Write a protein that binds this ligand. Structure first.
Ligand SMILES: [Mg+2]
Ligand SMILES: [Mg+2]
Ligand SMILES: [Mg+2]
Ligand SMILES: [Mg+2]
Ligand SMILES: [Mg+2]
Ligand SMILES: [Mg+2]
Ligand SMILES: [Mg+2]
Ligand SMILES: [Mg+2]
Ligand SMILES: [Mg+2]
Ligand SMILES: [Mg+2]
Ligand SMILES: [Mg+2]
Ligand SMILES: [Mg+2]
Ligand SMILES: [Mg+2]
Ligand SMILES: [Mg+2]
Ligand SMILES: [Mg+2]
Ligand SMILES: [Mg+2]
Ligand SMILES: [Mg+2]
Ligand SMILES: [Mg+2]
Ligand SMILES: [Mg+2]
Ligand SMILES: [Mg+2]
Ligand SMILES: [Mg+2]
Ligand SMILES: [Mg+2]
Ligand SMILES: [Mg+2]
Ligand SMILES: [Mg+2]
Ligand SMILES: [Mg+2]
Ligand SMILES: [Mg+2]
Ligand SMILES: [Mg+2]
Ligand SMILES: [Mg+2]
Ligand SMILES: [Mg+2]
Lengths: 123, 157, 82, 80, 129, 205
RNA sequence: CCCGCAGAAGAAGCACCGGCUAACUCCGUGCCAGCAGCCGCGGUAAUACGGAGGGUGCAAGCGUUAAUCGGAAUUACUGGGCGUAAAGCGCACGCAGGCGGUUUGUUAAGUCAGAUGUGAAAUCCCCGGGCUCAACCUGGGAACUGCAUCUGAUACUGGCAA
RNA sequence: UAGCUAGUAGGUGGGGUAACGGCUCACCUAGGCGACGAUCCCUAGCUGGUCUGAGAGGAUGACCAGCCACACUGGAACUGA
């Protein structure tokens, strides 16, 4: 492109689009569990993945994954929502922070406890 | 005495009536560590035989580069297919700064201090060719003085 | 009123006053017309405890600048040491 | 001895005033191509001696009107 | 149309070298004569001459060394669209000094080395290596 | 803030003697030096170039007892300084007070020298220095304090000191237990099986 | 800050180990539970799930998420393209704008050189100095690529004249 | 978002201010700005600087410092350098 053309119409960089719009540039957000259910993943994989719909403190209502084996969540349980998508589940772009707020930790977990809110075993 | 380094190993396949025939290709570079570098590329059904064919080919087809105390004479651009490489002389202590494909070639060549970067396609097979061509066209003050019909300092000083 | 005074910058428990000429209304560590030396209360006794460009100080004093008690003490002490 | 600008008169339809365009070369901040830029100034012209298209020499002065802050020092060339 | 005769000269040199021509000829000009003079003095060409009065033709006799062109790369820098001016301390050097940069200064056309040694800057006409 | 675990494990991982023991005994009579630690030590790793760079950096770090943050700051300072970056990095590493104490032989190992420094047993220009990373400068006098000079470990350590090769750039008077840091060591006087340029690459990857 | 007493005595965790990327086996599980940054795992010996042993990397921290730059030569001015991969208007004329053959003179606008003023202090950088070292504080300098004025140079671009 | 502007643009004279000035008046002239983006809308305190980057640049303006604006929202004057 000619320099003359550039001085007439300057280059205009694309604005990066975020992949986590509901967080509004916050690392976590609080929310209430509206419904807690299971869904099946994409064609290649096969499972019953645990998800929950959560209405955020900023009005946004979005679906979030519930990692780990076992959870005690029901309607009106307030949970902390963290960034991070789950690939084989379209529409779910958020994770639940295990061990934060009402959300409890994973039972008997020993390795990678800090990612699931499990206290250091007293042994 | 020459030092040889294997840059990349890749598995190719050919399809025939019965099915897929698997083979391997090997890209290697040999060097004298004092300004002479050659590259080789071999094919075989098994990896050790492919590497040995590549070594034998690499020993020939080798060229001389007029190094300057382990660094280049002047900045150089090289171009082959979509691989555009840029190299420049560097001060002592810098070491070898380059991508892997260029890193191996320069290390076996003996360039101790060089700043390099590859633009465009980083395909190792063509990056090596473009690096070799760039290093080959790089001339020295004595050769440029010989061409221009003058002395060294008459260009330097 | 133009005044000559110390702008303490230093660090915690280790002050390093900077003699500066400034309008008295501006904050202590703020706008200053001209710096005319430094003073370090803590001194290794081999360093320069106080440096003063007495000439510029005299220039501003003649122009009419007043002098803080501590800057007057510093000027008097350096002239006495000489 | 006196700071001064030189320009051409683009319009004189105002009473005792004229607008002069001062054009200069400036290296483009990024691309580099030297581009022409124009600055139009409302200038004070006693006697209305400046015709449109004339090339005039101007100097800065005190505010003379809401916009006028420059006075005509001399005409350089007129009625091209 | 024709709008950079110095570019035309450089391109004639480049294409004649590529085509292994012994000599090249082009419409002359004082600037072309000075650029040919600096090239000759720096030894990138054998010699040059001008023939005629009303439509002067300038002719450059090129030079080859090992079946190779002595001039490896000749490129215009300050093209008409974008003029490139440099100060005495900003004068570029080609191939870390192995090549030459042609500079037009207030004291005539000369190399970057000469301009630096004379403490002047100017318009970077072209690079030759 | 310091590595406290077993020491010969590191030497086994790096495949060479790191002088992590006093030396009185041949290391091969104390461990299987030529085999990597762990269940799968015997298998040999076809190690990538990044692996060899990491191994070189770890070797130097574990030789000098320096953790990653401090070593990174050392690299930044060496890069800032004029001259060969790797060479000034090695000079900075060899200028540590604990290393100087070990070279003058007051400690059988660098860890023992570090403990000596920490426990107010070393003086620099007649001043008590308790920081391991204190940079020693040319024409400095490092001395054992009188009160700590009667420790049996230092008199024991001087024998190992006289049994290892004597550095050129230090003048040690063992009788008075004092020494003079004549000059910064060059590259040539220290071991030549350290590939500092690998570290230079690793901190520019 | 220094001196004395006691006693190894009061003090090590976190992530990872299929490839990218340094570090591997056993047991449990059986496309379930589950993992995941991407590629991808899991349907009966799983180095990819969970536990153990071993190991690798950091360390009084370690990981996860969010945001910016980088890698991205992926807005390319330095530094990209347009026959078929996204990209030459259906074609022509033409105003504003961009560029312009060759010689002589003149101009000093652009350009170059020099000087002056100014570009606050702190921050970055260099040589040093003081807190036992460092962070930190601090002396002098460089820099602040700029802007304006004045005196010069006249090759190139521009103006004017032929 | 392609047109905007009647104290708007300029002038004479009077008034007002510490001061020049459509600052305000009375009258006269009918102009002024704009594709080198006026007007309109959205967004935002600016700078020395900070992060990043080989560099040019990209982002950013917390702490320190210089400047501006506001003091429940809207408006107004008084005292006073
Ligand atoms: Mg399938
Ligand atoms: Mg072949
Ligand atoms: Mg590509
Ligand atoms: Mg620490
Ligand atoms: Mg590995
Ligand atoms: Mg089973
Ligand atoms: Mg896992
Ligand atoms: Mg199994
Ligand atoms: Mg596992
Ligand atoms: Mg993230
Ligand atoms: Mg970019
Ligand atoms: Mg492209
Ligand atoms: Mg197409
Ligand atoms: Mg067509
Ligand atoms: Mg023109
Ligand atoms: Mg002409
Ligand atoms: Mg001028
Ligand atoms: Mg400053
Ligand atoms: Mg000190
Ligand atoms: Mg300082
Ligand atoms: Mg002319
Ligand atoms: Mg009036
Ligand atoms: Mg006004
Ligand atoms: Mg706001
Ligand atoms: Mg970059
Ligand atoms: Mg106010
Ligand atoms: Mg309030
Ligand atoms: Mg109010
Ligand atoms: Mg009053």
């Amino acid at each position: 492109a000619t320099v003359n053309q550039l001085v007439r119409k300057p280059r205009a960089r694309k604005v990066a689009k975020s992949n986590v719009p509901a967080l509004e540039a916050c690392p976590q957000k609080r929310g209430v569990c509206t419904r807690v259910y299971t869904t099946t993943p994409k064609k290649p994989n096969s499972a019953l993945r645990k998800v929950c719909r959560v209405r955020l403190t900023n009005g946004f209502e979005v679906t979030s994954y519930i990692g780990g084996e076992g959870h005690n969540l029901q309607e009106h349980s307030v949970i902390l929502i963290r960034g991070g998508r789950v690939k084989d589940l379209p529409g779910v772009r958020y994770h639940t922070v295990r061990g934060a707020l009402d959300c409890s930790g994973v039972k008997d977990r020993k390795q990678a406890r800090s990612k699931y809110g499990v206290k250091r075993p007293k042994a | 005495e020459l030092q040889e380094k294997l840059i990349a190993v890749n598995r190719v396949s050919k399809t025939v009536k019965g099915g897929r025939i698997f083979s391997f290709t090997a890209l290697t570079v040999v060097g004298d560590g004092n300004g002479r570098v050659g590259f080789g590329y071999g094919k075989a059904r098994e990896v050790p035989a492919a590497i040995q064919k590549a070594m034998e080919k690499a020993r020939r087809n080798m060229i001389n580069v007029a190094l300057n105390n382990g660094t280049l004479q002047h900045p150089v651009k090289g171009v082959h297919t979509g691989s555009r490489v840029f190299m420049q002389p560097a001060s002592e202590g810098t070491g070898i700064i380059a991508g892997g494909a260029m890193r191996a070639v320069l290390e076996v060549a003996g360039v101790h201090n060089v700043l390099a970067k590859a633009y465009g396609s980083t395909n190792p097979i063509n990056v090596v060719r473009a690096t070799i061509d760039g290093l080959e066209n790089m001339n020295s003050p004595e050769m440029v003085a010989a061409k221009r019909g003058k002395s060294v300092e008459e260009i330097l000083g | 009123m133009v005044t000559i005074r110390l702008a303490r910058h230093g660090a915690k428990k280790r002050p390093f006053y900077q003699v500066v000429v400034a309008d008295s209304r501006n904050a202590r560590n703020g706008r200053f017309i001209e710096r005319v030396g430094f003073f370090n209360p803590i001194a290794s006794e081999k360093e320069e405890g106080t440096r003063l460009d007495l000439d510029r100080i005299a220039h501003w004093v003649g122009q009419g600048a007043t002098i803080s008690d501590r800057v007057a003490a510093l000027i008097k002490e350096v002239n006495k040491a000489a | 001895k006196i700071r001064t600008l030189q320009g051409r008169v683009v319009s004189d339809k105002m009473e005792k005033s004229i607008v002069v365009a001062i054009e200069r070369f400036v290296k483009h901040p990024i691309y580099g191509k030297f581009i022409k830029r124009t600055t139009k100034l409302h200038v004070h012209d006693e006697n209305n001696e400046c015709g449109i298209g004339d090339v005039v020499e101007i100097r800065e002065c005190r505010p003379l009107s809401k916009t006028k802050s420059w006075t005509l020092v001399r005409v350089v060339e007129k009625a091209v | 149309s024709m709008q950079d005769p110095i570019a035309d000269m450089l391109t004639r040199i480049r294409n004649g070298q590529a085509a292994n021509k012994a000599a090249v000829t082009m419409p002359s000009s004082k600037l072309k004569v000075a650029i040919a003079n600096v090239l000759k003095e720096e030894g990138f060409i054998e010699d040059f001459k001008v023939e005629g009065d009303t439509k002067p033709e300038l002719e450059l006799t090129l030079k080859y060394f090992q079946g190779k062109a002595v001039v490896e790369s000749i490129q215009r820098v300050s093209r008409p669209g974008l003029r490139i001016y440099k100060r005495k301390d900003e004068l570029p050097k080609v191939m870390a000094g192995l090549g030459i940069a042609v500079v037009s200064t207030s004291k005539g056309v000369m190399t970057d080395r000469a301009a630096r040694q004379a403490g002047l800057g100017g318009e970077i006409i072209c690079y030759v290596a | 803030a310091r590595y406290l675990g077993p020491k010969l494990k590191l030497s086994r991982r790096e495949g060479t003697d790191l002088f992590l023991k006093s030396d009185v005994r041949a290391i091969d009579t104390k461990c299987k030096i030529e085999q990597a630690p762990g269940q799968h030590g015997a298998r040999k790793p076809r190690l990538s170039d990044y692996g060899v760079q990491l191994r070189e950096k770890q070797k130097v770090r574990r030789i000098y007892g320096v953790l990653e943050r401090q070593f990174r700051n050392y690299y930044k300072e060496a890069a800032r300084l004029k001259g060969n970056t790797g060479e000034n990095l090695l000079a900075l590493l060899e200028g540590r007070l604990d290393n100087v104490v070990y070279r003058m032989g007051f400690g059988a190992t660098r860890a023992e020298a570090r403990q000596l420094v920490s426990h107010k047993a070393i003086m620099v220009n007649g001043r008590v220095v308790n920081i391991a990373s204190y940079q020693v400068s040319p024409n400095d006098v490092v001395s054992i304090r009188e009160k700590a000079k009667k420790q049996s470990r230092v008199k024991a350590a001087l024998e190992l000191a006289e049994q290892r090769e004597k550095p050129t750039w230090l003048e040690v008077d063992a009788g008075k237990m004092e020494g003079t840091f004549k000059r910064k060591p060059e590259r040539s006087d220290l071991s030549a099986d350290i590939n500092e340029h690998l570290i230079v690459e690793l901190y520019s990857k």
